[PDB]
C-alpha cells in the first residue's frame, strides 16, 4: 500500500507497449487510434478530501475524471465510449474498471521506483504505459 499522496503529481508518458492493440481490442477506429498511438500525455493527479482528479492532457485531446474511491461514476472515454467506472485502492494500486455493453476493461495505476506504471487490459491484450515525473 502506497496511499493516494504517492500518486499526486504531474507525470509525462515516456514509454508505451501494445497501446494500438489495446485500442483495437476495444473497437476504437483508425482516426482515434491515429491520435492516440504517438500521443505523449501528461497525467495530472490531485486530491482534495475524498475527491481524486486525474487529468490526461495531450496536444490533440484533453480528458478528465473526478471520483471518490468505491463510488461508481459515469465516464465518457477518449474514444467516446459511455461507460460506468469504479476505482478502488488495493495494495497501493489504483484499480479502475470500466463497464459498458456487457464488456469490461481494467486500468491499474501503480507507483514502482520512479515510475507511474499503467497496465491496461482488454480480453487477451495487455498494454503497459510508463510515466515519469515532469
Ligand atoms: O492514461 C493513460 O495512459 C491511459 C489512456 C490514455 O492516455 N489514452 C489516450 S491519450 C490520448 C488518446 C487516448 C485514447 N485512449 C483510447 C482508448 C484506449 C482507451 N483512445 O484514445 C486519444 C486522443 C489523444 C490523446 C487510455 O486508457 C487507459 C490508460
UniProtKB/Swiss-Prot annotation:
Entry annotated with the keyword Ligase: no
Taxonomic superkingdom: Eukaryota
Lineage, top ranks: Eukaryota, Metazoa, Chordata, Craniata, Vertebrata
Major subcellular site: cytoplasm
Effect ascribed to mutating residue 25 to D: In a breast cancer sample; somatic mutation
Protein name per UniProt: Fatty acid-binding protein, adipocyte
Binding-site residues, a fatty acid: 129-131
Keywords: Acetylation, Cytoplasm, Lipid-binding, Nucleus, Phosphoprotein, Transport
Modified residues (Phosphotyrosine): 22
Similarity remark: Belongs to the calycin superfamily. Fatty-acid binding protein (FABP) family.
Residue positions, PTM Phosphoserine: 15
